[PDB]
């Protein structure tokens, strides 16, 4: 039953940097200290991204609707798995064939179905204080799913579900795109030792699998848990944990292999000029002096047209 | 002594060269 | 003489969008015939 | 194709078609159906190529207009109701059902759209039963005139013509999606061999060459790495190379004096086809010598060559 | 494809006559030209090689009143060594002061 | 601009079947009306036949028409036909195609109604 | 024509890429043409 | 009323090396740079560099007088 947690603290969104994340295999191919300049989407560099409070301390719980336009880079700082999965699609509310990619307590779960995925979704565990254990006991995320198409599941499994202490150790990075009625993902998995931010450095984001939906997301949410020990929709405590969000976009990159079929580093023809010819001579080191990249056009405006003056119409009204 | 048929200027300009002649 | 240089696509494509998906088509001729100009546009800088 | 029921033209179903295999000959060479014209591909031919997945398509509509089924074509269907695009791939299958649709009265059944605001894309099927307007002043919803619902019902009759008796149609997809495969004909697998060129067919792409023990590593999802030229040289482990090209060139004294002649060949270790080495390659019919001259005819590398 | 035989493979003759009649004309179009800056870069070497083959026939087998054919100098003796794809001069010459 | 050619019209003896029709071609069906007629009287006005919904099954009937009379047509070749079963000799006036719009009950009131000239269809006897 | 925004604004796109497929096997034909007449007249410069 | 082509042009990039350092300057050759710190030129527009009234030898070469370096 859709119950609307609140306790719920109000405030302004976060912002970030997008030091080199949002890069990924594009293709399913290999090479050797070979530089390619594969056009396809990615993520432009030193741009802005999203930050999202989940923190103990408020309650200040972050999962609201947010949109999948044309690519996403999704981020989840952790100590405890909190981040377990997503929810998307265009209407959310069993209408419209919905998706979501879920990890629970035991299963990976991921099911392309109708679910009436309404106001506020969540998972949220039990803790005993009586026998130190965590343990899933709420799911309360859709409402209705009559008709159906596609679902894929794992063997299951065992997973902590308990909440530790300290600074964030675990750096997750996942990827979802929609392109030939497919939904392209792949995925890292980084360890850090950070407290608050997104680390720096390079990281190659290799895939894991290519979903065939042929769905039209427009829009999704998050699936982060929750825990508890108040009310339905005040009795629970958040953890810490925060995510980042980037959108994907068509850049012309160029990507440094190694003697391994592995990414290391990776340039953009178009993010500043420096850049721009960095490709036009095709290596991430140049040597002194000039070098013609691009065209300079301007673009026009106010189109017009201007025929004889008319001053002389046909005359109608002596019709 | 438009459409895509541009011109360069040189490193090189009449006084410049004028003064290498002179000197 | 005077150094010359021409912008490979507009030449081939007269401000289309069109086009240069096309030009893309027919290799890296628009990253050749530049070299090939340039090549004689700073040799005569050092002629002189 | 044995499904008894089929959906419509403006809901034209659609199935995903993996992890399987098809002898299509079958369908070629069944000859029970009107056309199987196929672009892209070469009808006879499906058997040695494969994919990883066939989007199965199947409409039906009068064979008056699956000529209306052809990629560019232009048809009010063709334009409002399915679009294929200038590049498709595939083949187009598509029969009569008269004996199997029709009854007398026109069976209603089989519905069919008019209009629409634009065109559709390719594959962008549009199932929408809002009503189609041409009036300025929206109806909002009161059917009629310049306001309409934009669908009508062929209703064929167990009387009816050619180009209004119904073919049922169906369209396959086999858009080279290569990154693995899946979907995959009918042949006979073969032993694998190393150290000698010969042809091959890994998974649907054909070369030749000499195949030899990969030292590199892939990842779970890899199949193969091209090096430069979009190349492949390696698949599923092997790596490849070709084997040996080279090149030709004949020596003599000048015919005044012989008929006798040396064989050059370039770059190459003649071990691999008396007899001499060289960096130039190896030679056919001279002698590797200790003594010192002026040089007449040169090969390279050193070796010139006279009587 | 810009591959042959992936074409070869996948359709028959004709129109892999009409296709293969393209990807000719590029890999023609694309030699010719290729020949072409590697014909007249033939000659380039030539006129800077007859004339670094002057040098070894006046400046290193001799002495040559010209100036700056023979190094910045009155010059004296030239002395020559190797290169992997060319030659090297060394002059020797006189500068007062 | 919505047309109804008329077919069928004349005199005929007091118990026939005959086969009258209804057409509309190169319309582009906007999408399916109900489709039939109406029969005026030499003194009294017209009354409603029948009914089929355009590219459909269902259909109306008058109590006249509904025994003996049955309207059948077809879209793609854009047409209808109440047959002139039995040929009651009232059958004495001039039919008249009428063109009911999206709606089928509508037509039951029929001013609206496009119209075809009219097929006069005497029913002698 | 010799125009390129026409032909796209007169056609559909099928034949408007072969006629533009045309239009540029020409071009790129004028173009390595007077580059190689741009270079020979770039050397011959030189030798003076 | 006479007609005229809105500004073309290429560009250029200005470089001393990456193996010194990652600044740079941008060319927009035979061009106003109102039409777009700034340097005018018979060879376009500098921009990202200072107008030094100095004199010094030519490492990079922009044109009609002005070369630039570091
Ligand atoms: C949270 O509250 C909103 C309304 O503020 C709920 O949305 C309502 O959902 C019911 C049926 O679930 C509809 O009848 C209402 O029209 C909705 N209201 C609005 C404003 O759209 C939402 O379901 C609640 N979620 C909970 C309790 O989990
Ligand atoms: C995680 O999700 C899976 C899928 O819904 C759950 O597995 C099912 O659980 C129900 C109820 O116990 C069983 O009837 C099914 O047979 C299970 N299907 C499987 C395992 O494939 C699983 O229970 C969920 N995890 C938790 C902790 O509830
Ligand atoms: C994907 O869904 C979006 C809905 O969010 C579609 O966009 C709508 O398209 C209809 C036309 O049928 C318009 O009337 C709406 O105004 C559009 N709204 C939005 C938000 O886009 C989009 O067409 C769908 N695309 C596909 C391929 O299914
Ligand atoms: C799609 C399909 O195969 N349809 C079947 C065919 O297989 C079979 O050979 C034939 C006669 O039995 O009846 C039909
Ligand atoms: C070098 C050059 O032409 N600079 C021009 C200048 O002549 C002109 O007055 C001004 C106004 O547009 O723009 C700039
Ligand atoms: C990104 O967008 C935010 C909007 O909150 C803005 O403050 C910021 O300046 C933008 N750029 C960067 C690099 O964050
Ligand atoms: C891949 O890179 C690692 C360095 O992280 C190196 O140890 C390994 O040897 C490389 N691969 C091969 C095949 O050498
Ligand atoms: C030719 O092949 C033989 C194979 O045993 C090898 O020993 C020899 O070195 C090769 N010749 C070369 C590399 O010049
Ligand atoms: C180029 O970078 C290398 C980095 O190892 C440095 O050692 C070298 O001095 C640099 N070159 C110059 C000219 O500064
Ligand atoms: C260069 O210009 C500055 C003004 O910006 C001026 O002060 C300086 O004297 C000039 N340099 C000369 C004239 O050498």
């Known amino acids: 039953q859709c119950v609307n947690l609140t306790t719920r603290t109000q405030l302004p969104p976060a912002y970030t940097n997008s030091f080199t994340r949002g890069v990924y295999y594009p293709d399913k191919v290999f090479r050797s200290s070979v530089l390619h300049s594969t056009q396809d989407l990615f993520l432009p560099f030193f741009s802005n991204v999203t930050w999202f409070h989940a923190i103990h301390v408020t309650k200040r719980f972050d999962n609201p609707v947010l949109p999948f336009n044309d690519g996403v880079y999704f981020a989840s700082t952790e100590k405890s798995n909190i981040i377990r999965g997503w929810i998307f699609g265009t209407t959310l509310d069993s209408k419209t064939q919905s998706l979501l990619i879920v990890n629970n307590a035991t299963n990976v779960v991921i099911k392309v179905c109708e679910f009436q995925f309404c106001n506020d979704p969540f998972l949220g565990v039990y803790y005993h204080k009586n026998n130190k254990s965590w343990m899933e006991s709420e799911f309360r995320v859709y409402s209705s799913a009559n008709n159906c198409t596609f679902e894929y599941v794992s063997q299951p499994f065992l997973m902590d579900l308990e909440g530790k202490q300290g600074n964030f150790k675990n750096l997750r990075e996942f990827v979802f795109k929609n392109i030939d009625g497919y939904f392209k993902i792949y995925s890292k998995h980084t360890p850090i030792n950070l407290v608050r931010d997104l680390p720096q450095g390079f990281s190659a984001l290799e895939p894991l699998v290519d979903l065939p939906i042929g769905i039209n997301i427009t829009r999704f949410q998050t699936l982060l848990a929750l825990h508890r020990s108040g009310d339905s929709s005040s009795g629970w405590t958040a953890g810490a944990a925060a995510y980042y969000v980037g959108y994907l976009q068509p850049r012309t990159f160029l990507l440094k292999y190694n003697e391994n079929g592995t990414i290391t580093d990776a340039v953009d023809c178009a993010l500043d000029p420096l850049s721009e010819t960095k490709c036009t001579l095709k290596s991430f080191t140049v040597e002194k002096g000039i070098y013609q990249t691009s065209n300079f056009r301007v673009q026009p405006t106010e189109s017009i047209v201007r025929f004889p003056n008319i001053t002389n119409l046909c005359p109608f009204g002596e019709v | 002594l438009f459409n895509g048929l541009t011109v360069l200027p040189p490193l090189l300009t009449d006084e410049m060269i004028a003064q290498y002649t002179s000197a | 003489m005077t150094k010359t240089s021409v912008d490979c696509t507009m030449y081939i494509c007269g401000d289309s969008t069109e086009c240069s998906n096309l030009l893309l088509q027919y290799g890296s001729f628009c990253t050749q015939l530049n070299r090939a100009l340039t090549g004689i546009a700073v040799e005569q800088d050092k002629n002189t | ?307 | 494809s810009s591959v042959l035989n992936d074409i070869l493979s996948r359709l028959d003759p004709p129109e892999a006559e009409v296709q293969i009649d393209r990807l000719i004309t590029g890999r023609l179009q694309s030699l010719q030209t290729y020949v072409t800056q590697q014909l007249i870069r033939a000659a380039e070497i030539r006129a800077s090689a007859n004339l670094a083959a002057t040098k070894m026939s006046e400046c290193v087998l001799g002495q040559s009143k010209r100036v700056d054919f023979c190094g910045k100098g009155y010059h004296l003796m030239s002395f020559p060594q190797s290169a992997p794809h060319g030659v090297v001069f060394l002059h020797v010459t006189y500068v007062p002061a | 601009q919505v047309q109804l050619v008329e077919s069928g019209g004349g005199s005929v003896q007091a118990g026939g079947s005959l086969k009258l029709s209804c057409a509309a071609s190169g319309y582009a069906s906007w999408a399916r009306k109900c489709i039939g007629w109406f029969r005026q009287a030499p003194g009294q006005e017209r009354e409603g036949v029948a009914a089929i919904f355009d590219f459909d099954g269902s259909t109306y009937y008058s109590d006249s028409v509904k025994g003996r009379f049955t309207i059948s047509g077809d879209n793609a070749k854009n047409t209808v036909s109440l047959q002139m079963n039995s040929l009651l000799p009232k059958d004495t006036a001039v039919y008249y195609c009428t063109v009911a719009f999206g709606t089928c009950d509508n037509w039951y009131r029929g001013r609206g109604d496009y119209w075809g000239q009219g097929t006069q269809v005497t029913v002698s006897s």
């Open chain 4, 1 to 307: 194709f044995n499904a008894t029921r089929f959906a419509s033209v403006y809901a034209w179903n659609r199935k995903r078609i993996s992890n399987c295999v098809a002898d299509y000959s079958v369908l070629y060479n069944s000859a029970s159906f009107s056309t199987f014209k196929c672009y892209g591909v070469s009808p006879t031919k499906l058997n040695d190529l494969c994919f990883t997945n066939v989007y199965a398509d199947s409409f039906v509509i009068r064979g008056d207009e699956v000529r209306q089924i052809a990629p560019g074509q232009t048809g009010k269907i063709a334009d409002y109701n399915y679009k294929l695009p200038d590049d498709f791939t595939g083949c187009v299958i598509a029969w009569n059902s008269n004996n199997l649709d029709s009854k007398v009265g026109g069976n209603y059944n089989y519905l069919y759209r008019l209009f629409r605001k634009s065109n559709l894309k390719p594959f962008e099927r549009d199932i929408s039963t809002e009503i189609y307007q041409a009036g300025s002043t929206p109806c909002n919803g009161v059917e009629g005139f310049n306001c309409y619902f934009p669908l009508q019902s062929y209703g064929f009759q167990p009387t009816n013509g050619v180009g209004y008796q119904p073919y049922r149609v169906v369209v396959l997809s086999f858009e080279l999606l290569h990154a693995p495969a899946t979907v995959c004909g009918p042949k006979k697998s073969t032993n694998l061999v190393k150290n000698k060129c010969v042809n091959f067919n890994f998974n649907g792409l054909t070369g030749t060459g000499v195949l030899t023990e990969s030292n590199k590593k892939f990842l779970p999802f890899q199949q193969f790495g091209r090096d430069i030229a979009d190349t492949t040289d390696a698949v599923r482990i092997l790596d490849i190379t070709p084997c040996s090209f080279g090149g030709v060139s004949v020596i003599t004294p000048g015919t005044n004096t012989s008929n006798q002649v040396a064989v050059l060949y370039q770059d190459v270790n003649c071990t691999e086809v008396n007899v001499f080495q060289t960096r130039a390659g190896c030679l056919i019919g001279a002698e590797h010598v200790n003594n010192s001259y002026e040089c007449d005819i040169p090969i390279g590398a050193g070796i010139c060559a006279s009587y």
